[PDB]
Ligand binder design. Structure first.
Ligand SMILES: Nc1ncnc2c1ncn2[C@@H]1O[C@H](COP(=O)(O)OP(=O)(O)O)[C@@H](O)[C@H]1O
Ligand SMILES: Nc1ncnc2c1ncn2[C@@H]1O[C@H](COP(=O)(O)OP(=O)(O)O)[C@@H](O)[C@H]1O
Ligand SMILES: [Mg+2]
Ligand SMILES: [Mg+2]
Lengths: 160, 371, 118, 74, 371
């Protein structure tokens, strides 16, 4: 998302103090101002913060579509400050339950790959190959063709 | 709408909607309160596990059947079993479905009246009807005559029927059934060293009886063979290891059916109460009853009983008559299949005990014309 | 495995499903209004006599009694459904506590706080 | 039990709900208005009862879902 | 407010606020009066150093544990230890915090009643609750079944639990624990020339035991190997130099757990009292207890015990059952982590023994419903 400006103007000093401490630790001279994410991860790890390290590494392998390799302030700083849990409200459990019920045209207690595919056709989302297997891992936590509203909730909870 | 064909039984409750081939939900009828203290807090421990749930937590429960011999001895537990059957195993509210219970012959009236009063007041069904457990088993065979021996788990009864006209003076009800065979097997297993005492271990002995025991074609020859060779000793693995070996206890447990003197009962076996039930009938329908002897009920599933019984009756009966024993492979659910067929009939649709009729005459309506 | 594209797809699925539910509930409201108009027929009394009023009051009493009895039954059903919902919610909460509550705690609540002052 | 107590509550509801019935005693316009009001009230009652039917059906489906869940716990 | 999860133990007092991962303050429970005369004036010499302060001045003190085997033998010293724990290691006045003590199974009643009377009269807490030390260790593992062997430093007890229902008739409490292993190690070290006698040098022998001893997978093979090669002799530096070399004393000290005949105790080892505790349980929950054997307590931290115990039980148990031994890395504080989890529960919030209840029924309230 493009919440980069929203993030930089939204951060609380409780985490901005650590952000400025890491700014001092990283930027100490002979800095281009881009601030390499590679050293950023190590510095934040040394700071005692506890994010998930591997996901940011995969993102660095993937994010920055322009292929700079050293992400500018916005995206890498967002991933850094992801230690602050400012999510998209997590929606509501009742809303998602109603959604799952609306999808449950089969009325079998679960929504399978076919109903999800029909929903994607309705919204017109791009054909993705992560399908089926994403339902198998998230929805079919028991591998039985059954997915309740908890797997649906945890599938895209707090998506931003 | 569709009718609910429930069948209380004694040992397994079988239920399902009318018009199908097999009962939808079959589960033991046991209600077991926990007996130990319980230290984990917030574990969500209930006060009584009923049905098939108490066959998995039976290690810390005290299972107790609510139906002793056909009759019902503990009405609160039976009400709990019915409530479970309706709401959790079928998930259909009883306010919108007729029910067809089943009852053994020659049972106390108060049992039947209390059953109908419960069904009409607590569960509030639209209409219920009570049928004798043997006529249904005769329906399922597609016959219209024949003498049916319905050896359930609670009580063994033998109702002869001809051309649709039941003979009320020839019903021979005997109280030896599967439960007494389980107790006798549990009592003779002690001759090798295996002691089962707890009410939970009665289930293990029942499993042993189901999986290993068989009815011997000739008793003395089998007793002599098992005492010389060792070709009969079949082993079985308990729920924790320590396999056991059953010797001549295999065919001695179900032999009690043909010699009730083993468990101290005076009466004659199921091979001779059928012949007595036939001989009480009129002299002109004995050939048809001889030719259409029907077996039903769970306990008649022992491997090799349809031959032992035929041999015994052929020994008793006159040499000219042909003795034939109908033993369908779907013996266990024969009563329920017959119940489904009966509930699916159009001619039967006006025999239900409608609720307004009960409101006008009280629970004693069941003994009246609506039988 | 893309992530930003995954996030966009999930949030757009949420928004589209919400819009579909809103339009479907609007359709349900329209169908309910149609059913109400049919079964509870619209009543016009412009330039009609008083025996019409008497018949209307009679039918009104009859239909009020029958609908109140039916809604009494439906309310009993709703109360039973609410009781079942509360019980099953309690049971699911107990299951989630058994599976997850022991894992829920404040780890390093103060252990990491005090490091070397001792 | 569970057959007259609920019957008694329903009877009491009918008694309190069914008001005094008197028509030919009054002017036509007043009775016409009152009858229209009662018709609209009972129509709204029908609407509410139907919404309750739909909601309780959905909650029954959710109860089936929770039954499947507790079955998955064993 | 927050609850204080204290855990008296015997050897290490572990305490901390409810809801964390690790105890805030862990320190030995010893109170040592000075024994020499003392000539410097105004040095500020106190009359009793408790806790971790007396492990630094132990050269001129006579340390004495106030808890012998679970039970408390010296109430004044225990009161002093509690006062220190509350005021100096946590610095929270007890007037504003509930407390959750822990107690071994099968302990004398008077000990528990005196404990609650002290907590309510001297420290004047709002509400306190006493819990069995094994149920907490089962909480920490996130299980709900399993048989937990909590081999502390005072007493080793083995509480089996199924589905949250504790089995009170199958608790096997044995009084061999870490302290007896320390004494036996101190007694077998004399076979090389090293004599430790003073109550201060018992701490040095304890450190030797912690850092060097390990449990042998097979005892006879290790005894044969240590008697031929010299690959086992590990050296250790005393608090003043003069390094010592421990030979086959390394695996002979903790072997006493599996052969209590070494220290003259009659009973069977911790490998066989677990199997006996299982066999007293019902026949249908033995598989689950076999599969979920839990280890806890400090003394179960010897390198290589989770394999020796599994080998022994697999030898004893039937060949079909799977034997699994849960040995979490956070074994030492398992009881306290479980205590924190239990105190953090909402369902448990109404089980505390409120002070007004104690005022109405006296100290004997603890044996009542509020257990
Ligand atoms: N395959 C089997 N072999 C031998 N005995 C069986 C078998 N199945 C069931 N039984 C016995 O029959 C009993 C079940 O009988 P059932 O027909 O369910 O009684 P009910 O008439 O009460 O339904 C069980 O208790 C068991 O002892
Ligand atoms: N790492 C270790 N290796 C071997 N033994 C240990 C180790 N840590 C502690 N012990 C033994 O365990 C005892 C501490 O046990 P603990 O669990 O604190 O007892 P309590 O149940 O009273 O808290 C010490 O006396 C020591 O003998
Ligand atoms: Mg039967
Ligand atoms: Mg301990």
């Amino acid at each position: 998302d493009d919440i980069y400006k929203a993030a930089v103007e939204q951060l609380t000093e409780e985490q901005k103090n650590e952000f400025k401490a890491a700014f001092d630790i990283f930027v100490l001279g002979a800095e281009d101002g881009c601030i390499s994410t590679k050293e950023l991860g190590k510095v934040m790890r040394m700071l005692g913060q506890n994010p998930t390290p591997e996901e940011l590494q995969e993102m660095i392998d993937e994010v920055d579509e322009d292929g700079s390799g050293t992400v500018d302030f916005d995206e890498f700083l967002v991933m850094m400050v992801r230690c602050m849990k400012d999510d998209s409200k997590g929606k509501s459990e009742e809303e998602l339950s109603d959604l799952f019920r609306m999808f449950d045209k089969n009325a079998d207690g679960y929504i399978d790959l076919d109903e999800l595919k029909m929903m994607l056709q309705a919204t017109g989302e791009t054909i993705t190959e992560d399908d089926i297997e994403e339902l198998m891992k998230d929805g079919d936590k028991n591998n039985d063709g059954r997915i309740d509203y908890d797997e649906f909730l945890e599938f895209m909870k707090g998506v931003e | 709408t569709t009718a609910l064909v429930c069948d209380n039984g004694s040992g397994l409750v079988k239920a399902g909607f009318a018009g199908d081939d097999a009962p939808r939900a079959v589960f033991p009828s046991i209600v077991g309160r926990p007996r130990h203290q319980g230290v984990m807090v917030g574990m969500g421990q209930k006060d009584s596990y009923v049905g098939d749930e108490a066959q998995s937590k039976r290690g810390i429960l005290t299972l107790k059947y609510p139906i002793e011999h056909g009759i019902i001895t503990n009405w609160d537990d039976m009400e709990k079993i019915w409530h479970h059957t309706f709401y959790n195993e079928l998930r259909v509210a009883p306010e919108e479905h007729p029910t067809l219970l089943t009852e053994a012959p020659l049972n106390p009236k108060a049992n039947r009246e209390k059953m109908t009063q419960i069904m009409f007041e607590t569960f509030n069904v639209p209409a219920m009807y009570v049928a004798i457990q043997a006529v249904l088993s005769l329906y399922a065979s597609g016959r219209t005559t024949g003498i049916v021996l319905d050896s359930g788990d609670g009580v063994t009864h033998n109702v002869p029927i001809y051309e649709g006209y039941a003979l009320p003076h020839a019903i021979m009800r005997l109280d030896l059934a599967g439960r007494d065979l389980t107790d006798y097997l549990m009592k003779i297993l002690t001759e090798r060293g295996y002691s089962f005492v707890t009410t939970a271990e009665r289930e293990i002995v029942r499993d042993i009886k189901e999986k290993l025991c068989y009815v011997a074609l000739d008793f003395e020859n089998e007793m002599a063979t098992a005492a010389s060779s060792s070709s009969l000793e079949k082993s079985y693995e308990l729920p924790d290891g320590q396999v056991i070996t059953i010797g001549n206890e295999r065919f001695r447990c179900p032999e009690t059916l043909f010699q009730p003197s083993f468990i101290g009962m005076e009466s004659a076996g199921i091979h001779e109460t059928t012949y007595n039930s036939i001989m009480k009938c009129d002299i002109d329908i004995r050939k048809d009853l001889y030719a259409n002897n029907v077996l039903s009920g769970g306990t008649t599933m022992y491997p090799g009983i349809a031959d032992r019984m035929q041999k015994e009756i052929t020994a008793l009966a006159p040499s000219t008559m042909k003795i034939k024993i109908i033993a369908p492979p779907e013996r266990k659910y024969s009563v329920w299949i017959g119940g489904s067929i009966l509930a699916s009939l159009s001619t039967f649709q006006q025999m239900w005990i409608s609720k307004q009729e009960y409101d006008e005459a009280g629970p004693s309506i069941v003994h009246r014309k609506c039988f | 495995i893309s992530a930003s594209r995954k996030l966009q797809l999930k949030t757009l699925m949420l928004q589209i499903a919400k819009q579909e539910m809103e339009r479907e509930a609007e359709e349900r409201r329209g169908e309910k209004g149609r059913v109400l108009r049919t079964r509870c027929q619209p009543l016009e009394l412009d330039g009609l006599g008083f025996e019409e009023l008497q018949d209307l009051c009679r039918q009104l009493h009859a239909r009020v009694d029958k609908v109140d009895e039916e809604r009494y039954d439906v309310e009993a059903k709703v109360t039973k459904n609410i009781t079942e919902i509360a019980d099953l919610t309690q049971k699911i909460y107990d299951l989630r506590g058994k599976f997850k509550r022991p894992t829920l705690r404040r780890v390093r609540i103060s252990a990491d706080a005090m490091m070397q002052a001792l | 039990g569970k057959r007259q107590t609920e019957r008694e509550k329903k009877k009491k509801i009918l008694a309190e709900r069914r008001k005094a019935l008197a028509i030919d005693h009054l002017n036509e316009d007043q009775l016409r208005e009152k009858a229209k009001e009662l018709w609209q009230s009972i129509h709204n009652l029908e609407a509410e009862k139907f919404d309750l039917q739909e909601k309780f059906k959905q909650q029954k489906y959710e109860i089936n879902v929770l039954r499947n869940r507790i079955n998955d716990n064993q």
